[PDB]
Amino acid sequence: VNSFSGYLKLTDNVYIKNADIVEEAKKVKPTVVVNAANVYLKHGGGVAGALNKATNNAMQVESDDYIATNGPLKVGGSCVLSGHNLAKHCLHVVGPNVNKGEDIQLLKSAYENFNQHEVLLAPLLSAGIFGADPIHSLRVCVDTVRTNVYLAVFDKNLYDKLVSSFL
């Protein structure tokens, strides 16, 4: 038994809810929150801008030190950093950006990083501000992640479409 509430169960391991990943993290304080990162960990908008704002910019300060030491992530890659006031850890995952000409098959590579963590609260990768078809992103998630993932989709219209179209 865990602390996540109000989720619809899609599969043995994938759960979904119409929620802001930020308010959900503040309420639950999960072990892992996933950020929809870019390779530079520049948290300017969307999930990353909203998560970073909720940390009072401490996520950006930590991220700039990470990049100064390690250089950029790979598209499809990830790193584990602090979850600050939101979670124990933040898993920064880089889904492809189709607005940059970046392989949609890197989205499966992005969701494979979730399998190193038994449970995660996560957003739909490569959606919203980043561009991909969220219905596709949910299918890849279900067919790739084997650990327990709680998806917070911040669009009720899109949430209802994802649920009503889910195979």
Ligand X SMILES: c1nc(N2CCC[C@@H]2C2CCC2)c2cc[nH]c2n1
CB of 155 to ligand X, least distance (A): 4
Answer whether 121's CB lies under 8 Å from 24's CB: yes
Residue 44 or 65: the one with the smaller Cβ distance to ligand X is 44
* Under rule CB under 6 A, residue 46 binds ligand X: yes
Tokens of 133: 């078809």
* Under rule CB under 6 A, residue 37 binds ligand X: no
* Under rule CB under 6 A, residue 129 binds ligand X: yes
Which window, 86-94, 111-119, 141-149, 150-158, contacts ligand X (CB under 6 A)?
A: 150-158
| Residues in contact with 31: Cβ distance below 8 Å, sequence separation at least 6, in sequence order | 87, 88, 89, 117, 119, 120
Q: How far apart are CA 50 and CA 167, in angstroms?
A: 30
* Under rule CB under 6 A, residue 123 binds ligand X: yes
* Under rule CB under 6 A, residue 64 binds ligand X: no
Looking at beta carbons, which residue is closest to ligand X?
128
111-124 b/e with 16+ CB inside 10 Å = b?
A: bbbbeebeebbbbb
* Under rule CB under 6 A, residue 163 binds ligand X: no
Burial (CB count within 10 angstroms: exposed 0-12, middle 13-18, buried 19+), residue 40: middle
Residue 21 or 28: the one with the smaller Cβ distance to ligand X is 21
Q: How far apart are CA 162 and CA 56, in angstroms?
A: 32
Q: How far apart are CA 93 and CA 144, in angstroms?
A: 14
CB of 81 to ligand X, least distance (A): 18
Residue 119 or 158: the one with the smaller Cβ distance to ligand X is 158
CB of 42 to ligand X, least distance (A): 15
Catalog residues that contact ligand X under the rule CB under 6 A: 20-22, 46-47, 50, 123-124, 127-129, 134, 152-155, 158
